[PDB]
Amino acid sequence: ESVKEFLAKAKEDFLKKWESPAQNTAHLDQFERIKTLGTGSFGRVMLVKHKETGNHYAMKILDKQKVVKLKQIEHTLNEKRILQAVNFPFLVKLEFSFKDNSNLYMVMEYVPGGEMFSHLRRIGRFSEPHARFYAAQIVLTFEYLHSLDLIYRDLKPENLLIDQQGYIQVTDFGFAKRVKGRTWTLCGTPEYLAPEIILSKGYNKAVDWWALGVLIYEMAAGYPPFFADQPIQIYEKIVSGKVRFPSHFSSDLKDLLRNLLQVDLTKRFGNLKNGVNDIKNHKWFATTDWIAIYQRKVEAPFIPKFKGPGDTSNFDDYEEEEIRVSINEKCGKEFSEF
């Protein structure tokens, strides 16, 4: 009942911001651009320093014309409208947003510990208690997002950042959507797509729980449950749904993953009468103190190295590119509400 009432208050908070979104709350000239932290299919994210406060932030830059070509206009409006409205300990905070003639800009808190992705590839795999610590945070974050009628749709290590205390921050709300019924857009990342997305069925928040199953498998194995050299091959494996587990996977871990990586929607954990509690009460999570995790009272498995305020040593290096702002406004109508 306490979770229920917590989520009720959170929804009140969310809806006020959802209906009256923050807009135009800084300007590009207020930030010193330092270094690129990462790129994705759509945007480039740079470390910046706010001149007036000396705070460091991570600034996502989207080229409006590219957003249009890739048919991501409504998605990008979703992304900013949702991210500015949410508030949870494992969701990256949006501090400012604004636009100019050429680009859209989302200025977030800078999460300095790097992508989960880079640590996972370098170390090889996480032990089960390590993976469980991260998994617990995703479970609570999805409980929160889904209670707001939000579907996230891009869970993967590349979109999960480690903070200074070793906790997860979820970034990249590019495919997040507020929807009460089914939805139909083919989006996500190939290794993480639920079968019903691949098969062009309408789908719902159960796809996020499937993706949690992929993430837990990849964390604990060091490779995804379905991989190949090309996406088409990956899709064939996903739809067959046959999963093989490393021999070091515990009995409890295999059982959880069989229930998350479940092609039958009437059987998939997260999607049953008991909702998220089928997951929270599973044997693999028996040692998890869900409230202590929410309160960030649990000692983390590891703490990223941190040499200073603006240090970027936990991120790969990227080729830097000039931020050019055209003297003519591009796509003004399309992004009027941003």
């Binding site: 990462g38 994705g40 992705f117 590839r121 083919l186 990342t189 060091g222 050299d229 490393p246």
Partner: peptide, 20 residues
């Protein structure tokens, strides 16, 4: 080993989204 097959595959680097 499956690990060795993964490491020799073309998709061990950062994976971007799909669309359309």
């Amino acid at each position: 080993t499956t690990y060795a097959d993964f490491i020799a595959s073309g998709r061990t680097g950062r994976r971007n989204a799909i669309h359309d």
